[PDB]
Amino acid sequence: DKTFINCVSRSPTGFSPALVMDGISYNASSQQVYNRLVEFKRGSTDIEPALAESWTVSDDGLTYTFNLRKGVKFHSNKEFTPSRDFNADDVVFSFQRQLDPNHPYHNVSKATYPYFKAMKFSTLLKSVEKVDMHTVKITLNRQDATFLASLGMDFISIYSAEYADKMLAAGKPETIDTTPIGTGPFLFAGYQVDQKSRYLAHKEYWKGKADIDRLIFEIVPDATARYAKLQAGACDLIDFPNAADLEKMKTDPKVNLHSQSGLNIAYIAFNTEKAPFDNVKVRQALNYAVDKNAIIDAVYRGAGVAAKNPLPPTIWGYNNEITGYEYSPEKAKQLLKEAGFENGFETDIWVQPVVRASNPNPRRMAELVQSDWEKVGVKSKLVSYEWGDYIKRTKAGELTAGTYGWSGDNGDPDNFLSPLFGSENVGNSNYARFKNPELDALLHKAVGLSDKAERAKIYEQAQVLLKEQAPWINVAHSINFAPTSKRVQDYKQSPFGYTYLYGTKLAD
């Protein structure tokens, strides 16, 4: 009937949002089949009620009480049919699995809860308690102005406690991870490796049945094929088009091309705990060495902007008075000389193996940086690994310097600065291994304030500090594209980059 064909560039790492932390996986699971307690309005960073119908917050900002929606049905599959509606047990399960190392599901699928860790929920959460069947009370150890928006994030999707109970009893608990059951607008209808995953409209969805009956995420790895299929009408949406095809699609009558400035940053991270990158003068030098304009031209082809802060220009708290390091090989050489490296040195540049939102060609970007560094005496080899291995090694601190990128997930500047630069996230999401007590104090103070204007002043100061300490080269903020077929109606890009299809329709 009404089948939306979404052509995606890679197979998902997994279908359990608590266990992963990448957009392909989220798009193929939590964005379609799960709900959160609160969710973002489409195309917006504003939050609204979802599985929590309403809530209250205590005056001290430490106690959040959630009144849960009644009448909410979970999906079924061949292995499980729910015998009760969504309730507090499902919320408690979803938190406690991650929070409690001795929860029965903590080690199922060898789970590691990467985003739960980067968000520091283990130290944030004092308790998550069932008050009654339709009421959950969460107590915090400290104030967090971003907590409600954070509860809209995919990693804290609400799973089925009944499903978990049944699958554990049957001796196959991993089933809840590979074979998702949620309350969300679409339900999981199977995955064929390196071919496609399928979804169906959840007819009993609590907010009303979706206008699209069937969804297919067809895995079409070749960008050239994705474009050809879109033109033939075999795709209704594609990701990451090739540059030359993108140029054509801007004025292609068969394409409705959506675009928006990305809430993201592509960067070179320096391992600030590893000589010679532990010398701030070296990190500043390698900034001066790089011609970002040349990267915008060659890599982004103009679809992006040279970055001056790790925050994107379109988020609040962005510091407009900050300038990037100017392109000056002369200044780079002088600093390298002062650092004791007039004769330069040898190093590696780590190259990200897959394309993500913020950078359409990590390898070409690395080649350009490599060339720039060569001009100031810094010679390098490019080093890469398969995606999972690349990130694991990076987190362990094996990198020297490397290409990475980040898209924000809750609309708040804290969700850039804390995951990326907070000392507590070294080994998690802070690849530069940056530990700066002055920054930590700024971020800790800001996150708890209710006065947004004051939060903004603090983040602005934080950006001054980050420029001076140069844990990174801020490279670019990209443009997000969503090329669609002409029959797609009412589609909206997510501010965070996700493909969210509830509320989209298909014309005749």
For residue 55, the surrounding DSSP H or E stretch is strand 52-57
- Letters for 241-270 (x = contact with ligand GDS by CB under 6 A, - = none) are -----------------------x------
Q: How far is the CB of 22 from ligand GDS (least distance, A)?
A: 4
Cα–Cα separations (whole angstroms), residue 333 to 136, 287, 289, 341, 420: 59, 11, 8, 9, 28
Q: What ranges in 302-343 are assigned the alpha helix state H?
A: 329-338
| Residue nearer to ligand GDS on the CB measure, 20 or 289 | 20
Residue 506: count other Cβ atoms within 10 Å of its Cβ.
18
Selected from 16, 19, 22, 399, the binder of ligand GDS by CB under 6 A is: 22
Q: How far is the CB of 497 from ligand GDS (least distance, A)?
A: 3
| Residue nearer to ligand GDS on the CB measure, 152 or 405 | 405
Nearest to 373 by CA among 289, 277, 280, 474: 289
The torsion defined by the Cα of 33, 194, 406 and 485, in degrees rounded to 10, comes to: -70
Selected from 55, 390, 498, 500, the binder of ligand GDS by CB under 6 A is: 498
Residue 358 contacts ligand GDS per CB under 6 A:
yes
| Residue nearer to ligand GDS on the CB measure, 340 or 388 | 388
Which 3-state string (H, E, C) describes 443-494? HHHHHCCCCHHHHHHHHHHHHHHHHHHCCEEEEEEEEEEEEECCCEECCCCC
Q: How far is the CB of 164 from ligand GDS (least distance, A)?
A: 24
Residue 21 contacts ligand GDS per CB under 6 A:
yes
As given in the structure block, the two tokens for residue 272 are: 């600030």
Q: How far is the CB of 80 from ligand GDS (least distance, A)?
A: 28
Specify the stretch interacting with ligand GDS by CB under 6 A; choose among 39-47, 76-84, 363-371, 495-503.
495-503
Residues in 409-448 at the binding interface with ligand GDS, rule: CB under 6 A: 409
Specify the stretch interacting with ligand GDS by CB under 6 A; choose among 122-130, 219-227, 315-323, 354-362.
354-362
Selected from 407, 418, 474, 504, the binder of ligand GDS by CB under 6 A is: 407
Which 3-state string (H, E, C) describes 347-368? EEEECCCCCECCECCHHHHHHH
Q: How far is the CB of 305 from ligand GDS (least distance, A)?
A: 14
Buried b (16+ CB within 10 A) or exposed e, 321-359: eeebbebbbebbbbbbbebebeeebebbbbbbbebbbbb
Residues in 455-494 at the binding interface with ligand GDS, rule: CB under 6 A: 480-482, 493
Q: How far is the CB of 192 from ligand GDS (least distance, A)?
A: 20
| Residue nearer to ligand GDS on the CB measure, 239 or 372 | 239
Specify the stretch interacting with ligand GDS by CB under 6 A; choose among 52-60, 73-81, 144-152, 355-363.
355-363
Residue 157 contacts ligand GDS per CB under 6 A:
no
Residue nearest to ligand GDS (CB): 23
Q: How far is the CB of 403 from ligand GDS (least distance, A)?
A: 10
Selected from 283, 333, 356, 433, the binder of ligand GDS by CB under 6 A is: 356
User: 472 has which bridge partners?
Assistant: 269
| Residue nearer to ligand GDS on the CB measure, 368 or 378 | 368
Rounded to 5, what percent of the chain is helix, strand, coil? 30, 25, 45
Residue 317 contacts ligand GDS per CB under 6 A:
no
Q: Which residue has the tokens 């070294």?
A: 426
Residue 406 contacts ligand GDS per CB under 6 A:
yes
For residue 49, the surrounding DSSP H or E stretch is strand 47-49
Q: Can you tell me the distance from the alpha carbon of 376 to that of 330, in angstroms, rounded to the nearest whole number?
A: 8
Q: Can you tell me the distance from the alpha carbon of 493 to that of 480, in angstroms, rounded to the nearest whole number?
A: 9
| Residue nearer to ligand GDS on the CB measure, 128 or 501 | 501
Q: Can you tell me the distance from the alpha carbon of 73 to that of 82, in angstroms, rounded to the nearest whole number?
A: 8
Judged by CB under 6 A, the number of residues near ligand GDS is 22
The angle formed by the CA atoms of residues 62, 66 and 70, to the nearest 5 degrees, is: 175
Selected from 90, 162, 236, 239, the binder of ligand GDS by CB under 6 A is: 239
Question: Rule CB under 6 A: which residues touch ligand GDS?
Answer: 21-24, 27, 239-240, 264, 356-358, 405-407, 409, 480-482, 493, 496-498
